[PDB]
């Protein structure tokens, strides 16, 4: 068992090397030059941010309540890194008995990361804004469970390995046309700062940007696939990375192009408008395997 370290260390580098992508690709959107001075094309800057924040930068806590504040980043980073384990890939590390149920569970527990940070500060000034940030994540998790089930009820069980085999000739974007549009918006609620925005503070960046890649990959399993090929692992590995990278560009697209939707009208897009739409499509997706034979 050495492969676990081969899924944390290159992943922590992927969150680090995001700092290039998150302001150079975002840079050309805004007609500005991103990283250039630090490296040949700014490749030395992502690792330079780590030396700046981890070692030299000291701490000044508000109150430091015994166990908390030095426990919230462990829940933030821990839950973000454990999400990589059930991922199907070409081959998964320790494949669970049911796949997507583990995926929804560790994301619903990832709400605590922003909850314990609100309890860390003694002031009332911070906790009201902290609970508002919880409301952005907690509300969209209702619909996230519904849109997941509609894709599953079309084909395959909860296992993530079966979701690759069902996409043999055509993608799941075409049968789930309005549902694919939902996953572009619903994923951005989890601290992406595109439709709505709120030492150890630096550790939250390493956890929040990790979930951004996680939602990009998870959308490329439920809706993308193209080919499987069990005999050739070479063809799948390259083709999967390009599909995930194109979704990473769309995540940074919303951050630059579109203003914030307001907190009150975030509950008018969802609940008032999205929840009647998602359930109507869920009603449609119950009838689909009954109308025409479609059972795994």
């Amino acid at each position: 068992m050495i492969n676990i370290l081969m899924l944390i260390i290159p992943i922590l580098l992927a969150v680090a090397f995001l700092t290039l992508v998150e302001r150079k690709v975002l840079g050309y959107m805004q007609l500005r030059k991103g990283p250039n001075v630090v490296g040949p094309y700014g490749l030395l800057q992502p690792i330079a941010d780590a030396i700046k924040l981890f070692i030299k930068e000291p701490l000044r806590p508000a109150t430091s309540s015994a166990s908390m504040f030095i426990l919230a980043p462990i829940m933030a980073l821990g839950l973000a890194l454990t999400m990589w384990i059930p991922l199907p890939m070409p081959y998964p590390l320790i494949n669970m008995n049911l796949g997507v149920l583990f995926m929804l569970a560790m994301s619903s527990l990832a709400v605590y990361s922003i909850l314990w940070s609100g309890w860390a500060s003694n002031s009332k000034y911070a906790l009201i804004g902290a609970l508002r940030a919880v409301a952005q994540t907690i509300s969209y998790e209702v619909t996230l469970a519904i849109i997941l089930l509609s894709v599953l009820l079309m084909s395959g069980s909860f296992t993530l390995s079966t979701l690759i085999t069902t996409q043999e000739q055509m993608w799941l974007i075409l049968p789930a046309w309005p549902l694919a549009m939902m996953w572009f918006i619903s994923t951005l609620a989890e601290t992406n700062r595109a439709p709505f925005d709120l030492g150890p503070f630096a550790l939250f960046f390493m956890a929040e940007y990790a979930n951004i890649i996680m939602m990009n990959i998870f959308t490329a399993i439920l809706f993308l696939g193209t080919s499987h090929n069990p005999h050739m692992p070479e063809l799948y590995t390259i083709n999967f990375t390009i599909k995930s990278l194109l979704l990473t560009m769309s995540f940074l697209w919303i951050r630059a192009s579109y203003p914030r939707f307001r907190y009150d009208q975030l509950m008018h897009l969802l609940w008032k408008n999205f929840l009647p739409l998602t359930l109507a499509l869920c009603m449609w997706h119950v009838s689909l395997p009954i109308l025409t034979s479609g059972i795994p």
């Binding site: 084909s155 075409l174 046309w177 025409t292 479609g294």
Partner: protein, 69 residues
């Protein structure tokens, strides 16, 4: 001779011109492609599930065939 700043207008840069116009999508035509992709989506998907049934019955047949197990 006196030399000062000379006046030039030429094309006048066009004073207030509309650039925003309807492109690609018309209205009713987008629904023909939109709902058309859905109807093509279900028909292609359900044929694969019927091909899955060929594998499904054959998979469970292996358990019935194996009695020394």
């Amino acid at each position: 001779x006196x030399x000062x700043x000379x006046x030039x207008x030429x094309x006048x840069x066009x004073x207030x011109x509309x650039x925003x116009x309807x492109x690609x999508x018309x209205g009713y035509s987008m629904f023909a492609v939109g709902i058309g992709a859905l109807l093509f989506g279900y028909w292609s998907m359900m044929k694969w599930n019927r091909e899955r049934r060929r594998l499904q019955i054959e998979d469970f047949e292996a358990r019935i065939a194996l009695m020394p197990l």
